[PDB]
From a paper:
Spike (S) protein protrudes from the surface of the spherical virions and mediates virus entry into host cells. It consists of an ectodomain comprised of the S1 receptor-binding subunit and the S2 membrane fusion subunit, a transmembrane domain, and a short intracellular tail. Moreover, we captured an ensemble of cryo-EM structures of SARS-CoV-2 S trimer in complex with the Fab of 2H2 or 3C1 up to 3.8 Å resolution, revealing the MAb-triggered stepwise allosteric rearrangements of the S trimer to coordinate the binding of neutralizing antibodies targeting the SARS-CoV-2 RBD, also providing structural basis for MAbs 2H2 and 3C1 as noncompeting antibody cocktail.
To investigate the molecular basis of 2H2-mediated neutralization of SARS-CoV-2, we resolved four cryo-EM structures of the stabilized SARS-CoV-2 trimeric S glycoprotein in complex with 2H2 Fab in distinct conformational states, termed S-2H2-F1 (associated with one Fab), S-2H2-F2 (with two Fabs), and S-2H2-F3a/S-2H2-F3b (with three Fabs). In the S-2H2-F1/S-2H2-F2 structures, there are one/two RBDs in the up configuration with each bound with a 2H2 Fab, while the remaining RBDs are in the down conformation without Fab binding. Take 2H2 as an example, in step 1, the only up RBD in the S-open state binds one 2H2 Fab first, leading to the S-2H2-F1 state. Thus, once RBD-1 bound with a Fab, the resulting outward tilt of RBD-1 could break the allosteric constrains originally imposed on RBD-2, leading to an up configuration of RBD-2. Of note, compared with the S-closed state, the S-3C1-F1/S-2H2-F1 structures both exhibit an untwisting of the S1 subunit region, with the fusion peptide (FP) released.
Residue numbers in the entry:
A (entry chain C): 14 to 69, 78 to 247, 255 to 291
B (entry chain b): 1 to 218
C (entry chain a): 1 to 214
D (entry chain A): 341 to 582
The structure:
Amino acid sequence: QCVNLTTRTQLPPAYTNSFTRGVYYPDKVFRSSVLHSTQDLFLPFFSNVTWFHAIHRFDNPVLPFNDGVYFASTEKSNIIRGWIFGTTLDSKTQSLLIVNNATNVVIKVCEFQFCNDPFLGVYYHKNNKSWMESEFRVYSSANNCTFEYVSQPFLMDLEGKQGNFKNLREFVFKNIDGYFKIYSKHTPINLVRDLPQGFSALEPLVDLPIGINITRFQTLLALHRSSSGWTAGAAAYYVGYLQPRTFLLKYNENGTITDAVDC
Amino acid sequence: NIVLTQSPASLAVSLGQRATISCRASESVDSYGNSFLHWYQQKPGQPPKLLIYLASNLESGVPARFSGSGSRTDFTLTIDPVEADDAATYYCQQNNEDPFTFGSGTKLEIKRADAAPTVSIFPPSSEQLTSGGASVVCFLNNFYPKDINVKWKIDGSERQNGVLNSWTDQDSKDSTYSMSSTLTLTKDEYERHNSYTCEATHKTSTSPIVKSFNRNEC
Amino acid sequence: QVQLKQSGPSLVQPSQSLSITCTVSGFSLTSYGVHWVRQSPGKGLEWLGVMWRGGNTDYNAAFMSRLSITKDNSKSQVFFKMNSLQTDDTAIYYCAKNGGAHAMDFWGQGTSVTVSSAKTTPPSVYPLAPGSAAQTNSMVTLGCLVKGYFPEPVTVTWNSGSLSSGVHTFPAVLQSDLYTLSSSVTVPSSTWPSETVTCNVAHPASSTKVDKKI
Amino acid sequence: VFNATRFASVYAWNRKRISNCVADYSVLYNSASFSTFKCYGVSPTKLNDLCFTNVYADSFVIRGDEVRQIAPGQTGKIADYNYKLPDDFTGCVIAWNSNNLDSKVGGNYNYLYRLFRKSNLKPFERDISTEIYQAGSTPCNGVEGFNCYFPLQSYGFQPTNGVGYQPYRVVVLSFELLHAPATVCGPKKSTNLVKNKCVNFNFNGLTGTGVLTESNKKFLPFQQFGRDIADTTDAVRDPQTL
């Protein structure tokens, strides 16, 4: 209900500036050698955005979800296991639960009683490990489910590690009249600093016709311990607020967006 | 007091017609949403069975021809169509005030096809006479309607003391009536005359039912 | 499915007490009550009492202090304790399953309980066959005279139930502290005097089954 | 659900949530394995070209005489106290005589129904209360007797009873439209594909007229259509064949 991890080291909120990130394909139309003008929820260029870490600095605050938010999950040991979206973030109303149990990205919508800092646990990170999940502190209870979905099977590496970030898993989360669309893009990286100054068009992952109100969101994170004395590995994520400003999309002959311009 | 003045006392209805059975009650009413009672059907060869619960919903086990309605005090059972399976005694049980007694009971008879009785006399054997008893048995079974009059008349004069019968009601299996006539006599009375007769009179049989027999016919 | 046949009592004396065992089967006795009635003693079908759904009991206004009911969930049987029985209490008793609105949906076979101080008297069966000079019209009728027995009833059949067409079971006539039962069957000439015919009896109370040849 | 192994009661019906799928309803209408097929507000042939938000197949059984109560604009014991439907029910009710399936030796008395209730139910309001209430001012304190009825009663689904009492596996397909996006639809029937000929095409997303011919254009995995430099549709990926 109000489980907050105590191993978080008191540090101020980190911030950065997005150079050109937060652009995705707004439609399913193939175009060749054009500069298409469009207006939808994208991240404004040169806009100040936050920087949240998940390490042994473990950030998981209650952040606002007005229209949509852009994420850039920089992972090394795959600490990010999913996201939470809902209005009250408790069992009072319906709340979207996105979680990855290291085998399938489970997506459900029930009256999930989320805590102040939910997480998943991997016991025995040192010896006799087996990389098995035992603690599931995502929610306390669930009632009156309205949507259920399980992604394809995968195999995530729960090996706790320290150092730089290896994978760049960018996502976009928005809610437009119940159409909770999710974009994704996975690419490697060697990042030891703030959000990279680059560009990459994100492809659509899934489309969740849920039909609920969403005003705030959180992020699920994995922990390790050999449930308050747990610690995390090496990962981080960002939060960029989308706005319906005017943007251009430069399409190449192959049909991909190679560059964009914020008016 | 709850005087369940159920009427009529009995009925004799033909096939394909409509029979009506009323039921009166005193108390109580307004239990949850109604004040209706339960109806039953006691066949001569089967115990009672629930017909309609709350007088507005049919009950399984019995045919679905039963229906009806009723006021807060008066109730009515509509039997339509009257068939050969409705030969039974209907009742009306209280359900909302102790005691849950039934009505007076309305016996419904079905006017089936008529049939004449059989004739078979069985005088007592020499062993029965040695025991002390002497009971001539004359079976008049497989007939319809029940309007039958058996009356023994010995050759000497009209008998009115030893006349006896065992009238069987219309069974559920056997749709016809049956009656076993008997004549209680002593050894001297049986040997008083040689010839006797099992005299009877049936409604359908215009001619008199008679059959003579001797004492040595055993 | 629902079975509520009664048994146990055979013959009771007046001014005594004995319980009628109504065997419950087909439904949970704790979830449904069991009624108790008798077959029209004078006036219409007389209701005696009912066991509630695992609680108290209700009884007739006249039989409030006379009769009592008690349930035994261990044996799945309900006992109908009788007290102060008189000669007028002789009738066929039935039990039924408590319905929704205190209805009696399913009913049992019941049993005939006779109230009398006299003891059980065995029967004196006399086979009824036609004589050599007896008349006949394209048929041969037989009978069995079960005279001088007590208490009622007694079921009579023919050849262990082989003959069923012409069989007619009549009610027993009340004699002086005894009963006189009679039965008959219409059969062709090929079954008598050529073949052997045996008339069997069955006393439901004493379970007496003694065969008698015609 | 129509051919399920076992059904629920009339007041505790098994609400099977159906969403994000399709179904050819003409097969069920012509399945030759039903006793009643009555769709209210829309015919089985018209609903094949319509989509719905949520579909709930309420699974239960009732007697033959009670089938008329399960319909819009009809009252009764089950229509008011056990399972209340809306006055504007736009779904469809289907039933099948299950006397050879549900009934057994002695009668199947597992299906229960309430003879009354404290108040009439609302549209699509389920109640599983088994409490025995008092009718008069004399409190019974639980058990029934002396003016306090027991509402739950079992159905008399016997194998030798009349057709009015036999079981009918009623399946009320509750079709409704809520604020959420449409998820259920009918059979998306199509025609044969024609190539290298002037034919009018009609896809789910766009339509037009032209000669459909293969080319070296490579659409992305999510791109279903394509436009030229002038932002005009000049290419399309067939939804059936990639």
